[PDB]
Design a protein around this ligand. Structure first.
Ligand SMILES: CCN(C)C(=O)c1cccc(N)c1
Ligand SMILES: CCN(C)C(=O)c1cccc(N)c1
Lengths: 263, 265
């Protein structure tokens, strides 16, 4: 993997592995989600840096508020996929990472992604606007003119997700993370939530359709002795409305929607 | 990804990824477990397999994993390249063996070694059988002929009989169940998932203050749709040893038994 000629984006090549694919022998969206995580990490390494700089000074971290993924073709087992990624200021409101996936044999786009990150405090968890000296550390590693994997004005990735109302059409109750769901700081990694959201999609739908789009808001963390319930309801191509909530008091941790095409 | 000069062994290089490491920024045994699986798969393809022979596909026969044994000296750090060599051998009519060496790509030193016992089973009836000469011949031409053992030792902890755990268990993790990321391409629970289930009953205290040196795990039954697992661990003991049992939380049917051996950091 490497920074491009201008050092304002990063590329990496991945070979899809045997345990990385589902029953179509194409990559799961979770594998895809982990390669974006991975390529985003190596791009932080390359520049100097989760990707903190003048943040751990005041005990501050970046944290995913929203993931959005559109897949045209899921790479097959043995296929090389190329992912290019870059980061942009959304002023002091925001901070965005976009990805592009290409077939490394055709150079053709098979998938694109985008995400929103905000400041916190690993301790108090309180949201924080981005200061001047925080935009003087990373904005030298970012494109200055807007560059959007989702350019389209009023599209699928900027719009409000409603809260699923009881009763839910479908549910998988009592989901618990294991140690393999934890990152190196012992937090459930953003990708397990994607897994829990998809767990309440019926097998009939997975077996006959293909996931075209996922959109996931990150509202609260699950703390490895919390148990999640996962709720889905057909809102409709099939579309679903998603809610993850703590098994007990019913506290929201994620809401999302998904969009499937008939195979 | 290539067969060696003599095409009786296969080598692959893996770079350790961010989401593949634990609290020490070194790869988890499960990540190791997955790279051993990935490299075994690429070696089957390399000699033209899928790892069923011509006869096996005809007779609805598959290779199943009876025992996994893994000994790690050093877990490769996030960003480190790791080289794994793997090879198979006839264990006569009983079944096959697959053996792995893990090396550091920079120093060339062994950092781990694994070994496994594969038995032949009917897909459908789920019924073990011995290796017909018709089959032995089809894969023997892809195996070393002189024994080549990752675990040569005259009394190695890879071939020793594992007791069943007596109730009450010292530790337990109750109600474990697979999600879709736990399934392989043919919709069966991935063999690595049981490693993680086994290790869920090891208390955090041990994990935070020791390293896993040795895991030995026998496979007795699989998780066959809607099943829920309980995980049982009891200390059998510098070195902490454990005895392990997985069972279906209903009838209490055994699926796995195992041991682990941890050293203080
Ligand atoms: C799994 C990580 N999550 C959900 C968070 O820590 C979090 C909490 C509040 C707001 C946001 N954006 C994120
Ligand atoms: C998923 C792998 N497992 C547990 C099996 O299919 C199995 C069943 C019986 C004996 C053995 N050795 C393995």
């Amino acid at each position: 993997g490497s920074l491009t000629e201008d050092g304002l984006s990063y590329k990496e090549k991945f070979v899809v592995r045997s345990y990385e694919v589902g029953s179509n022998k194409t990559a799961t969206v979770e594998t895809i989600a982990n390669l974006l995580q991975e390529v985003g990490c190596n791009h932080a390494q390359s520049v100097g840096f989760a990707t903190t700089t003048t943040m751990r000074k005041l005990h501050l971290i970046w944290v995913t508020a929203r993931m959005h993924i559109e897949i045209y073709k899921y790479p097959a087992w043995g296929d090389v996929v190329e992912i290019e990624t870059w980061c942009q200021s959304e002023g002091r409101i925001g901070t965005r990472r976009d990805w592009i996936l290409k077939d490394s044999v055709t150079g053709e786009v098979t998938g694109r992604a985008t995400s929103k990150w905000v400041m916190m405090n690993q301790d108090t968890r309180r949201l924080q606007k981005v200061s001047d000296d925080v935009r003087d550390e990373y904005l030298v590693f970012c494109p200055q003119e807007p560059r959007l994997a989702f350019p389209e004005e009023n599209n699928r990735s900027l719009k409000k997700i409603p809260k699923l109302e009881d009763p839910a059409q479908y549910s998988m109750i009592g989901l618990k993370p294991r140690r393999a769901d934890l990152d190196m700081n012992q937090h459930v990694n953003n990708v397990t939530y994607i897994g829990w959201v998809l767990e309440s999609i019926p097998q009939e739908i997975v077996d006959t359709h293909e996931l075209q789009v996922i959109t996931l808001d990150y509202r609260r963390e699950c703390q490895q002795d919390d148990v999640v319930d996962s709720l889905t309801t057909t809102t409709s191509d099939s579309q679903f409305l998603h809610l993850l909530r703590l098994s007990g008091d019913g506290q929201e941790i994620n809401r999302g929607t998904t969009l499937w095409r008939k195979k």
